[PDB]
């Protein structure tokens with residue numbers, strides 16, 4: 001069963017801005033998603049400090065980057081704390097309505113789209129490069145769910161039928177036709193070293209074929 005939800009109006013406006021504004025520095029999406037994964041890995045690590053059983057669903061703490069040129073997807077996988085169904089629905093664990101306000105305003109002061117993460121809504125920068133985003137997630141206290149949106153004002157949530165991931169989150173970017181440079185090994189490597197060099201978890205870039 002698939003449930004369909006309307007985005008809050010501020011978030012719809014944020015996504016419409018990101019999708020349609022001329023902005024060439026689109027590579028920042030990858031910094032924001034890796035940074036979110038790092039935050040989520042810090043969270044399960046912190047929680048395991050007092051309850052080691054929270055790592056029963058997987059002790060490895062890492063980030064995988066999986067390009068697939070045939071499907072034209074770039075997938076970011078982490079083994080962080082994951083998100084519950086209620087988290088997913090409430091703007092993927094973000095305070096997105098106020099963060100959008102503080103952002104879509106701060107733009108009016110002296111601000112650039114690349115500062116989106118300072119306002120807690122860096123995830124939505126995925127729509128600089130993706131026409132659709134699927135978020136598959138598993139939190140210790142809930143089942144595995146898939147969130148999906150092609151923007152246009154709505155998103156869906158469903159129980160996920162794919163492979164069990166134990167614990168963590170998978171962001172599948174269905175790339176725009178003219179954004180396939182982010183499937184290229186050298187380009188992903190360049191972005192990671194430029195923006196993510198001091199992330200404290202191993203980042204594995206998968207190769208293809």
Ligand SMILES: CC(C)c1cc(-c2n[nH]c(=O)n2-c2ccc3c(ccn3C)c2)c(O)cc1O
Pocket residue numbers: 033035036037038039040041043078080081082083092093094095120121123135168169171
């Ligand atoms: C939001 C996107 C989809 C995303 C979320 C999670 C996730 N799993 N468990 C969590 O708490 N988070 C998380 C982590 C950081 C965040 C929020 C909200 C705002 N910041 C700064 C939520 C992830 O591991 C990867 C991701 O790309």
